[PDB]
Design a protein around this ligand. Structure first.
Ligand SMILES: Cc1ccc(NC(=O)c2cccc(C(F)(F)F)c2)cc1Nc1ncccc1-c1ccncn1
Length: 255
């Protein structure tokens, strides 16, 4: 029901019940969100469909995967000895973008509940933008905090847990988290302290920021501002944090 248009350049969701409360909901929601360069921009609703500025680069998940140059075009990759058309600084920027937008939202008592690369858009100038396309409609178990899984507790602290997973997806260049692990295998091991592993191409400092996000105690996780700031510090240094160069035994995090 989504269609491109010049309503400026944008995207509209055509809606003709339950869908009426969601539609009356989503708009009410987007109105309250305000405007920030790291969250979607709604141009308006009309009666004749909800429209927001269009994102020419799609969702971040797909973007990260097309970035897998060794798969998309090996001649170029090998020749240039690189694993992705995206650099560490660009990856960290997408991460800083989401943390920035999320900080603008959390400050407004807005709980996202479904942060994930799939729900992020890559728009004009490659500015990551927080969005929400919707959830059979099973729950996003791989991205949920332990407390969301067991008691349906949703907060900025649980949005941070999902964020940490998203950061992992970023570094992984879009790999599925808990690759080859059962959704139920998680309800078990997660409470036992199990966590995603440090991606091979990842500097310990990024991994540390990821661990902070998934701490069992909801109140011990960093705020979205402490994340923006720490990421900003990494973007600021000369040091490279996400290895993207190619090497003999190189391999991509699974999908
Ligand atoms: C067409 C359309 C209408 C409305 C929203 N809304 C959200 O996200 C949203 C809802 C509630 C809360 C938030 C949050 F706070 F997170 F910001 C965001 C997204 C899309 N866009 C859309 N929907 C489905 C498939 C593709 C696209 C799409 C493609 C390209 N560019 C822009 N949009």
């Amino acid at each position: 029901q989504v269609l491109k248009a010049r309503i400026m350049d944008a995207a509209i969701k055509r809606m003709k019940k339950d869908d009426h409360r969601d539609f009356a909901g989503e708009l009410e929601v987007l109105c309250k969100l305000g405007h920030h360069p790291n969250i979607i921009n709604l141009l308006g609703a009309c009666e004749h469909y909800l429209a927001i500025e269009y994102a020419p680069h799609g969702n971040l998940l797909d973007f990260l995967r097309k970035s897998r140059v060794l798969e998309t075009d090996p001649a170029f990759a090998i020749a240039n000895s690189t694993a992705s058309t995206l650099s560490s600084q660009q990856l960290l920027h997408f991460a800083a973008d989401v943390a920035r937008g999320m900080d603008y939202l959390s400050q407004k008592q807005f709980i996202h509940r479904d942060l994930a690369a799939r729900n992020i858009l890559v728009g004009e100038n490659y500015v990551a933008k927080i969005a929400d396309f919707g959830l059979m409609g099973r729950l996003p178990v791989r991205w949920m905090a332990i407390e969301s899984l067991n008691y349906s507790v949703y907060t900025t602290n649980s949005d941070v847990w999902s964020y940490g997973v998203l950061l992992w997806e970023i570094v992984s260049l879009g790999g599925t988290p808990y690759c080859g692990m059962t959704c139920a295998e998680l309800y078990e091991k997660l409470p036992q302290g199990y966590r995603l592993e440090k991606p091979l191409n990842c500097d310990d400092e990024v991994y540390d920021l990821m661990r902070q996000c998934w701490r069992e105690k909801p109140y011990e996780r960093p705020s979205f501002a402490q994340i923006l700031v720490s990421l900003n510090r990494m973007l600021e240094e000369r040091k490279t944090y996400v290895n993207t160069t190619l090497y003999e035994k190189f391999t991509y995090a699974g999908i």
